[PDB]
Amino acid sequence: LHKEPATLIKAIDGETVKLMYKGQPMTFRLLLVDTPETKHPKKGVEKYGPEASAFTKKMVENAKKIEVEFDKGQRTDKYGRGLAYIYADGKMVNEALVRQGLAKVAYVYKPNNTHEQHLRKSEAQAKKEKLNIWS
Ligand SMILES: [Ca+2]
């Protein structure tokens, strides 16, 4: 893989953060995780979505270094969003959200799945801990 510098522009929600990467503002999708929603037109807000976006916000905002890392497969999805693992001070947000019961592992697509068993290891710990979506 290769980690890269990127600069925070805007945390949209749990799974989506806007970042200046290569000098271009880009929408980035947190690879492998699915967070609850704040806005879904046919839904309203979903349980733990407010605090899933809160979490990521705090995490990318108080960071001194944000780094993105692309996986070994296509790097942009269909809606043109970067496909990546985001590190706030070297800690993987994508992992942090699952360790805290605020994200389930999901849409795991070969070959963009290098870190599938690390996160699938962490969801298991949070489930075993009765935490938040697993409560
Ligand atoms: Ca979602």
**103 in Cβ contact with 14 (< 8 Å):** yes
Alpha helices per DSSP H over 17-92: 49-61
C-alpha 74/C-alpha 63 separation (Å) is 27
Distance CA(117)–CA(39), nearest Å, equals 29
State yes or no: cis peptide before 41, omega within 30 of 0.
Answer: no
Spacing, Cα 53 to ligand 1 middle (Å): 11
37 is catalytic: yes
- Round to whole Å and give the CA distance between 88 and 108: 22
Report the candidate in 78, 55, 81 with the shortest Cα–Cα distance to residue 68.
81
Catalytic residue flag (residue 81): yes
Q: Which experiment gave this structure?
A: X-ray
Catalytic, out of 81, 95, 99, 123: 81
| Resolution for this PDB entry, in angstroms | 2.2
Let me know if 133 is exposed, middle or buried by CB neighbors in 10 A (0-12, 13-18, 19+): buried
The one-character DSSP state at 114 is T
Q: Which amino acid is at 76?
A: T
By three-state DSSP, how is residue 48 classified?
A: coil
Measure 59 CA to ligand 1 centroid, in angstroms.
18
Domains and CATH numbers, the chain: 1-135 (2.40.50.90)
